[PDB]
Every structure is written in structure tokens, then in C-alpha cells.
């Protein structure tokens, strides 16, 4: 086929910049229970998910895939994508996670919910890392789209791998442009992709706690129950 796999590295960056969803606000007001906080996160996330679906469709190559593969990739990738997104926008708020512009959590608001703090720190560690490398908006969106394409690829083939090679070239185009020597381009790419494992790890953990929360019982959205029931 085409047609993705015929984009310049510069117009690939642009397609992805153009598709970026907006940063959504929280419904937030009112002191915090575990219930209030968790109904807030699930309201926000539910709405973020709808943008993510639409955003996925603008990831060049995604829409060539079969609807059922689209469903699988999104069902694997969803909470990684939200995490990477949280991490990235929390980047200039050391110690703090910017869930929404009007919902910035500090370490110790994390403790309302069981085992949320541990994840909290994991995201903080990641945020710190992005900062310490100075992740760039354009690198970020390649990463975000690697997640989507990679997360559920080995739990299914060759169209996905061509696109991925395209995203890597793109990532490398970026670093060649920032004037990094070849050696530090290969090192940077490595450092960026290793972070993806930490993102998988956190998603996996957040997922199991989401599962235990649904038992504990805030009501989850229908879209959110479905996304979650895919990992059970």
C-alpha cells in the first residue's frame, strides 16, 4: 500500500503536531475524598479518551489498519497514552502532576487512593527524566505515536513495522536537526525508547489498581469499563 510510508520526516512531524489533542480541564471545584478525587480523574480520562480515539485516526498509517486492529492497539495503548500525556504536561511542575490546568496534584494528595502514591512517584521519576533530557514537543509526539503502534503489536504485522521505522527516522531527523552528533543521536533514541518500558510498567500497574478500584467501588464510564475489561 501507501501512503504514510511516503511522508518526509518533516511532514510526519507536522501531521503529528496537527493531530495533538488539546489539554482538557477538570470539572474540579470542595475538599477531597478518595471518591471525589477518583470521580474527577475518571471524568477527565473519559473525555481524554474520546480525543485520543480521534487523534489515533490522525496518526499516519493507523487508518490503513483494520478496524479490529485499531481497536486492539487502542485497547492496549490507552492508559500508556494518557500517562505519557500526563508526564509530558507535568514536565514544568517538579514534584507535581498536572492532571489538568486546574488540577495539579502534589505527592501527598496521591495518598487518598490506595497504591496511587507508588504510581505517582513512578510518573514523577519519568517527568524528571523528560526534564533532565529536555524532551521536545516534536519528540514527544513521535513517542506518543510509537506507544500506540507498539503497545499491542506483539499480542496480535508488517505495515505497523514499516510505520515504526518511519517514526524512528523521524525521531532521528529531529536529533540530526537539533545538531546532535551521530553517536549522541543513537544514544538519545536509546534513552527515549527505554522510557517506553517504564511507561508500560506504570500502565500495567495503574491498570491493576483500576481493576481493584472497580471492585472497591466510584462508578466508571461505559467507555472506560470496556477499555479496562480488555486487560482482564
Amino acid at each position: 500500500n501507501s501512503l504514510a510510508l511516503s511522508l518526509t520526516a518533516d511532514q510526519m512531524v507536522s501531521a503529528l503536531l496537527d493531530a495533538e489533542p488539546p489539554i482538557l480541564y477538570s470539572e474540579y471545584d470542595r475538599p477531597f475524598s478518595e471518591a471525589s478525587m477518583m470521580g474527577l480523574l475518571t471524568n477527565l480520562a473519559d473525555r481524554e479518551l474520546v480525543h485520543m480515539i480521534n487523534w489515533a485516526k490522525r496518526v499516519p498509517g493507523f487508518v490503513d489498519l483494520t478496524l479490529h486492529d485499531q481497536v486492539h492497539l487502542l485497547e492496549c495503548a490507552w492508559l500508556e497514552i494518557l500517562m505519557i500525556g500526563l508526564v509530558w504536561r507535568s514536565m514544568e511542575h517538579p514534584g507535581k502532576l498536572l492532571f489538568a490546568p486546574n488540577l495539579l496534584l502534589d505527592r501527598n494528595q496521591g495518598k487518598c487512593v490506595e497504591g496511587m502514591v507508588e504510581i505517582f512517584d513512578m510518573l514523577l521519576a519519568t517527568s524528571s527524566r523528560f526534564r533532565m533530557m529536555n524532551l521536545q514537543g516534536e519528540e514527544f509526539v513521535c513517542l506518543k505515536s510509537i506507544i500506540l503502534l507498539n503497545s499491542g503489536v506483539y499480542t496480535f504485522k508488517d505495515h505497523i513495522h514499516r510505520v515504526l521505522d518511519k517514526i524512528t527516522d523521524t525521531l532521528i531527523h529531529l536529533m540530526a536537526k537539533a545538531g546532535l552528533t551521530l553517536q549522541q543521536q543513537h544514544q538519545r533514541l536509546a534513552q527515549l525508547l527505554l522510557i517506553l518500558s517504564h511507561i508500560r510498567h506504570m500502565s500495567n500497574k495503574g491498570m491493576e489498581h483500576l481493576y481493584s478500584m472497580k471492585c472497591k467501588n466510584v462508578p466508571l464510564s461505559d467507555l472506560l469499563l470496556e477499555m479496562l475489561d480488555a486487560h482482564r
Binding site: V50, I53, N54, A56, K57, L67, Q70, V71, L74, E75, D222, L223, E226, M227
Partner: peptide, 10 residues
């Protein structure tokens, strides 16, 4: 008919 299905179709 997952809700995800509909959103991806439209």
C-alpha cells in the same frame, strides 16, 4: 458493538 467501535467508525 463496543463504545470504542462506534467512536472509531465515526
Amino acid at each position: 458493538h463496543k463504545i470504542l467501535h462506534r467512536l472509531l467508525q465515526d
